[PDB]
Design a binder for this molecule. Structure first.
Ligand SMILES: N[C@@H](CCCC(=O)N[C@@H](CS)C(=O)N[C@@H](C(=O)O)C1CC1)C(=O)O
Ligand SMILES: [Fe+2]
Length: 329
């Protein structure tokens, strides 16, 4: 068997309030989890995840092949050269099971200064036809802001955990410019399930997505109640329990950089499971020009021998590297 990973449930509700002592007690729990397996479940987060799941299912199960081409990123549709990040990521029946829809900051409109400048990693979202998907765009944009709010609260907790003032990360995480993305991933049930869509780990475990560290500051994830994730620990890969009432939180490699690996970006992978399910990550990314000076909370003077890295540089390079390592999703 595989051992169960320690993934504590942390009540994050004080991070929305003004009880500073209570916030510190939450920060300590985040610190402990970040130093152990690198994962925890945020509970009492205030988001209606059942409705998120229902609206997402309605979208995934009603979108047609025609609409998928019309929304497709450039990896699938050469006509859409502006769509590197945002849009539809098609399955390939017989070869690739997973499919998804990615969207970015709703404030990236045609008149946004970064859109006008054609700055890398900024795109205007594409949406299906409103008549075919009534309410979907509005729901999805509102969801972005709901999970942005949770993420801002979580970032106050991580800042306090690291010995900083609570706005240390959040001051770089702003509605007008965040590079954060939502991805609505569908993992299908298939009978037969094509072997070409199943990868195999060195230890023999059947996978849908190989080992990686996240390209993010933190990752704020909702998934269906079907166990699939594993995290590498000193004791080997361990199973992360599912919990479709909470958000699974972990650090990405930008956090590891900024903290000199005090909070590591945990290595994790996705087991192959033949089940119809949802994986709905929010990747907490800062602004394109955001730079936090690296530090080390294990060193008396707090100094680090790492060089500052702008978030835009980090992100553009990280997303390409992840595609090169683990394949186009
Ligand atoms: N397209 C997105 C980035 C996608 C990065 C990516 O492919 N991530 C993987 C590894 S974290 C991913 O989303 N995998 C999901 C899965 O396979 O279920 C995860 C975290 C829920 C953007 O432009 O921001
Ligand atoms: Fe990941």
């Amino acid at each position: 068997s595989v051992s169960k990973a320690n993934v504590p449930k942390i009540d994050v509700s004080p991070l929305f309030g003004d009880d500073q002592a209570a916030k510190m007690r939450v920060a300590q729990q985040i610190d402990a989890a970040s130093r152990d397996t690198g994962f925890f479940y945020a509970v009492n987060h205030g988001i209606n995840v059942q409705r998120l799941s229902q609206k997402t299912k309605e979208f995934h199960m009603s979108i047609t092949p025609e609409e998928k081409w019309d929304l497709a990123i450039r990896a699938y549709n050469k006509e859409h050269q502006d769509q590197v990040r945002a849009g539809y990521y098609l399955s390939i029946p017989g070869k690739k099971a997973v499919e998804s829809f990615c969207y970015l900051n709703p404030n990236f409109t045609p008149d946004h200064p970064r859109i006008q400048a054609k700055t890398p990693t900024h795109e205007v979202n594409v949406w299906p036809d409103e008549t075919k998907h009534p309410g979907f765009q509005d729901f999805a944009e509102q969801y972005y802001w709901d999970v942005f709010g949770l993420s801002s609260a979580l970032l106050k907790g991580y800042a306090l955990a690291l010995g900083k003032e609570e706005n240390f990360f959040a001051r770089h995480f702003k509605p007008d410019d965040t590079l954060a993305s939502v991805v609505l991933i569908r993992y299908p049930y298939l009978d037969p399930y094509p072997e070409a869509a199943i990868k195999t780990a060195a230890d023999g475990t059947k996978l849908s997505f190989e080992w990686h560290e996240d390209v993010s500051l933190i990752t704020v994830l909702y998934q269906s109640n079907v166990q699939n994730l594993q995290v590498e620990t000193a004791a080997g890969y361990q199973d992360i329990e599912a919990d479709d009432t909470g958000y699974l939180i972990n650090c990405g490699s930008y956090m590891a950089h900024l903290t000199n690996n005090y909070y590591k970006a945990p290595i994790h992978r996705v087991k192959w499971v033949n089940a119809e399910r949802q994986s709905l990550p929010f990747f907490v990314n800062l602004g394109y020009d955001s730079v936090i000076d690296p530090f080390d909370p294990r060193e008396p003077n707090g100094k680090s021998d790492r060089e500052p890295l702008s978030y835009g540089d980090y992100l553009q390079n990280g997303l390409v590297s992840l595609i090169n390592k683990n394949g186009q999703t």
